[PDB]
Amino acid sequence: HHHHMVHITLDPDTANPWLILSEDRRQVRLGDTQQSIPGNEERFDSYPMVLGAQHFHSGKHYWEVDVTGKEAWDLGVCRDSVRRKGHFLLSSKSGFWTIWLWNKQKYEAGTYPQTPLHLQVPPCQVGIFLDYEAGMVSFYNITDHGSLIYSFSECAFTGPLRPFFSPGFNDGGKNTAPLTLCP
Ligand SMILES: CNC(=O)c1ccc(CNCc2ccc(-n3ccnc3)c(-c3cn(Cc4ccc(OC)cc4)nc3C)c2)cc1
DSSP, X not given: OGGGBOOXXXXXXXXOTXXXXXXXXXXXXXXXXXXXXXXXXXXXXXXXXXXXXXXXXXXXXXXXXXXXXXXXXXXXXXXXXXXXXXXXXXXXXXXXXXXXXXXXXOEEEOSSSXXXXXXXXXXXXXXXXXXXTTTEEEEEETTTTTEEEEEEOOOOOOSOEEEEEEOOOOTTSOOOSOEEEXX
């Protein structure tokens, strides 16, 4: 899978106005203040979400995302046609293929309804591999010699796909450090 690595970048036309992007486009975290920027159709107005720039309509692709220290997060890939505006469900049935950490140590998966996870080694880095023809997306624990964490399947896929991120709320003030796309 490592042999399908692709360069991903944060598209700032989607980013929630509370989110701070690095100047290299390799980092997202939540800023304590808001930002004045356009009201455009592509932006997530409610929830702290941002997309990858690159559209995929075929082939095998793979990236890695550091999450060292973080007490929550959401990683995945989604259809280009997903809603951006208002309140909704992270679910495969709504075209979101995702996993998350919430409540400090509670790992879970975007089935409807949602499927908890049982991991022996808490992941510090996470591999995401999409194979568009196969209709699959997969997720690996880098810290634990690359063990498989969960894998969507029989996905169909008809339109363009997008990498998908969220560094989580810091409701507690202890989830401040960012998602950093690693090499
Ligand atoms: C934020 N909190 C809630 O809204 C909430 C909503 C419902 C529940 C009820 N139990 C199911 C359950 C548990 C956990 C989660 N979750 C938490 C983090 N990621 C996923 C979800 C979930 C979340 N979304 C959308 C989303 C994702 C991230 C985000 O920013 C960080 C904002 C919006 N959709 C579902 C479905 C559902 C618990 C918490």
